[PDB]
Design an enzyme around this catalytic site. Structure first.
Site, PDB file in Angstrom:
ATOM      1  CG  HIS A  41      -0.561   0.218   2.471  1.00 37.05           C
ATOM      2  ND1 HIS A  41      -0.717  -0.751   3.446  1.00 37.05           N
ATOM      3  CD2 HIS A  41      -0.025   1.323   3.038  1.00 37.05           C
ATOM      4  CE1 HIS A  41      -0.236  -0.219   4.558  1.00 37.05           C
ATOM      5  NE2 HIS A  41       0.196   1.024   4.361  1.00 37.05           N
ATOM      6  N   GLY A 143       1.989   6.109   9.593  1.00 34.33           N
ATOM      7  CA  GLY A 143       3.395   6.019   9.218  1.00 34.33           C
ATOM      8  C   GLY A 143       4.122   4.843   9.856  1.00 34.33           C
ATOM      9  CB  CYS A 145       2.407   0.859   7.279  1.00 32.83           C
ATOM     10  SG  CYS A 145       0.838   1.664   7.669  1.00 32.83           S
TER      11      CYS A 145
HETATM   12  C1  VEY Z   1       1.110   3.309   6.959  1.00 35.70           C
HETATM   13  C2  VEY Z   1      -0.171   3.942   6.513  1.00 35.70           C
HETATM   14  C3  VEY Z   1      -1.090   4.175   7.685  1.00 35.70           C
HETATM   15  O1  VEY Z   1      -0.683   4.775   8.666  1.00 35.70           O
HETATM   16  N1  VEY Z   1      -2.359   3.671   7.627  1.00 35.70           N
HETATM   17  C4  VEY Z   1      -2.920   3.175   6.400  1.00 35.70           C
HETATM   18  C5  VEY Z   1      -3.527   4.048   5.499  1.00 35.70           C
HETATM   19  C6  VEY Z   1      -4.089   3.564   4.329  1.00 35.70           C
HETATM   20  C7  VEY Z   1      -4.067   2.204   4.027  1.00 35.70           C
HETATM   21  C8  VEY Z   1      -4.775   1.682   2.768  1.00 35.70           C
HETATM   22  C9  VEY Z   1      -4.315   2.453   1.520  1.00 35.70           C
HETATM   23  C10 VEY Z   1      -4.507   0.195   2.519  1.00 35.70           C
HETATM   24  C11 VEY Z   1      -6.287   1.864   2.920  1.00 35.70           C
HETATM   25  C12 VEY Z   1      -3.440   1.342   4.924  1.00 35.70           C
HETATM   26  C13 VEY Z   1      -2.871   1.815   6.096  1.00 35.70           C
HETATM   27  C14 VEY Z   1      -3.265   3.691   8.812  1.00 35.70           C
HETATM   28  C15 VEY Z   1      -4.601   2.963   8.596  1.00 35.70           C
HETATM   29  O2  VEY Z   1      -4.682   1.746   8.725  1.00 35.70           O
HETATM   30  N2  VEY Z   1      -5.634   3.753   8.296  1.00 35.70           N
HETATM   31  C16 VEY Z   1      -6.932   3.229   7.885  1.00 35.70           C
HETATM   32  C17 VEY Z   1      -6.865   2.588   6.523  1.00 35.70           C
HETATM   33  C18 VEY Z   1      -2.649   3.346  10.160  1.00 35.70           C
HETATM   34  C19 VEY Z   1      -2.909   4.120  11.283  1.00 35.70           C
HETATM   35  C20 VEY Z   1      -2.458   3.716  12.525  1.00 35.70           C
HETATM   36  C21 VEY Z   1      -1.744   2.537  12.607  1.00 35.70           C
HETATM   37  N3  VEY Z   1      -1.470   1.768  11.548  1.00 35.70           N
HETATM   38  C22 VEY Z   1      -1.915   2.184  10.357  1.00 35.70           C
END
Ligand code: VEY
Ligand code: VEY
Lengths: 304, 304
Positions: A41, A143, A145
């Site tokens: 992602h 961030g 991830c």
């Molecule tokens: C690392 C990115 C992040 O913090 N995310 C995240 C955003 C968006 C995605 C997709 C594009 C797959 C939808 C995945 C991960 C956060 C998250 O899960 N937000 C909801 C999707 C996040 C926030 C806190 C902890 N881990 C991840």
């Protein structure tokens, strides 16, 4: 004496963390040998969150679109491929700090340490368990991830988890290092409810043995039970069923303390039925389930 | 989201651990620059436990009697001196892995990470607090002496603790890196009872703010209190008195959440008076006091 939620020393993993940027998205990557592993992602924009077509999004990316930085030095990307939900970025330099490592897919109930990272830099280390519903109750911000979960056996790091997302209920979902999610979760911003988060019975019993070894014995009673009788109680309290395999793994703790596994199950049964009456066990007011029998033995013997 | 008992990444400290042997006693040492720091009780035998005269015992030791091993390679000892309860072994080689570091003597209520070690090898990392009675509730077995406590600010390791002993009550005592014990403890096998282990009030409040930030809000009430009214409750429950300095340090958490410090004190007062009624806060069934206001801000902001 004393018993703590202990994480593995994180040094070997710290030396593998890098920052991966694609377009305007930055997350963490894991640099082992000449490959950087990160959540696929990283290629998603704000509009590719609801239903991303990763194969279509990846066609628009070339090796130069993946910026990989290890500390303050840039890594040259000479290849990229998608394996399940992870990207593998081949770089032209082997990580000199690459430890002896393995990729393992853990079972629910197993524990591991997480090195939370942001922009390729480690912020902290903590001990987790893979829940029976395939979520982890972590501490991850935006961030984080690409932060990884691992176990260590002397000098070998077994990577088991890579963080991908947070479910709307505040729990965390991710993959093994082959990019396969634990549980039914998808790397998409959609309704993904988690299942019943049951208690890891074999771990609670291991922790009760750790309590006895450390002097907390008030919960020991004059009763015993059977696996079937205990399991009727476990089902009522949303505890995982205890099997003979679980009894067998608790054998060394039973031998060290002289308390038969079924006698300890009977103490657990009474604690479930009566509660703790305002008392504590190993500084906790609830039954702890994130210590495996192996963790208890390791901590109580001082395995380095 | 999510809130965990998080320790600092231990890599910078792992690179400093060495094994020190004197006679038949082996413990851990801390190698920084060309000096190895270790508990002076490394010179004690089984008969020098009740009332050792460290100056007299040290006269019988020469540089060659201190065996210092870093991994599998031996360090050459070119000097030795006693500073309070620590030995400083000058070696002929500067540790190449020496991080930027400071020696700090912490105040009670402050937190730090411990890298538990045995025979110079790290076994695990966990987060601790210096208790108000100057003990630490750690996880240390025989041979863990010389394991250190530390905090990290970007690239600087501030060493604050060196493990020396276990009191007969299973709690732990040690020194700062100048060899001065925290509290009244002595490096002697004698009756050393610990004082009242009170609760670190400012830390419990910081943790309640962390709970609000993460969605656990059930304990928020419609009441307020004053510092003097709250402190009457704190004294009754063996909580440390809350000062205006404590209120001031909780300012950023109060500003972020919009909950005045005194309003949060009133929620705490009700939780002390009524208990949790079988409910949990951040996965805990008791009021957690080993997170400082700084720790809450750091974890909730992702400081690397
Ligand atoms: C690392 C990115 C992040 O913090 N995310 C995240 C955003 C968006 C995605 C997709 C594009 C797959 C939808 C995945 C991960 C956060 C998250 O899960 N937000 C909801 C999707 C996040 C926030 C806190 C902890 N881990 C991840
Ligand atoms: C590192 C030595 C050790 O494990 N000790 C210990 C033994 C003896 C002494 C003296 C010589 C000062 C009395 C100090 C420390 C353990 C201990 O404290 N035993 C009682 C004195 C120990 C055990 C577990 C954890 N930490 C220390």
């Amino acid at each position: 004496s004393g018993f703590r939620k202990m994480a593995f020393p994180s040094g070997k993993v710290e030396g593998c963390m890098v920052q991966v940027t694609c377009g305007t998205t930055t997350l963490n990557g894991l640099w082992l040998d000449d490959v950087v592993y990160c959540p696929r992602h990283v290629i998603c924009t704000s509009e590719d969150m609801l239903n991303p077509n990763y194969e279509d999004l990846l066609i628009r990316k070339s090796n130069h679109n993946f910026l990989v930085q290890a500390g303050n030095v840039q890594l040259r990307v000479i290849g990229h491929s998608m394996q399940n939900c992870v990207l593998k970025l081949k770089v032209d330099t082997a990580n000199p700090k690459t430890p002896k490592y393995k990729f393992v897919r853990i079972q629910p109930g197993q524990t591991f340490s997480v090195l939370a990272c942001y922009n390729g830099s480690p912020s902290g280390v903590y001990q987790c368990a893979m829940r029976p519903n395939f979520t982890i109750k972590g501490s991850f911000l935006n961030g984080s991830c690409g932060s990884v979960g691992f176990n260590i056996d002397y000098d070998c790091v077994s990577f088991c988890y890579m963080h991908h997302m947070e479910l709307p209920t505040g729990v965390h979902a991710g993959t093994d290092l082959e990019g396969n999610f634990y549980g039914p979760f998808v790397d998409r911003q959609t309704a993904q409810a988690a299942g019943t988060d049951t208690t890891i019975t074999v771990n609670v019993l291991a922790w009760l043995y750790a309590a006895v070894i450390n002097g907390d014995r008030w919960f020991l009673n004059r009763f015993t039970t059977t696996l079937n009788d205990f399991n009727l109680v476990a089902m009522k309290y949303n505890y995982e069923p205890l099997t003979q395999d679980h009894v067998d793994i608790l054998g060394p703790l039973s031998a060290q303390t002289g308390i038969a596994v079924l006698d300890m199950c009977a103490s657990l049964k009474e604690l479930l039925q009566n509660g703790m009456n305002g008392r504590t066990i190993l500084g906790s007011a609830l039954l702890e389930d994130e210590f495996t029998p192996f963790d208890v033995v390791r901590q109580c013997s001082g395995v380095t």
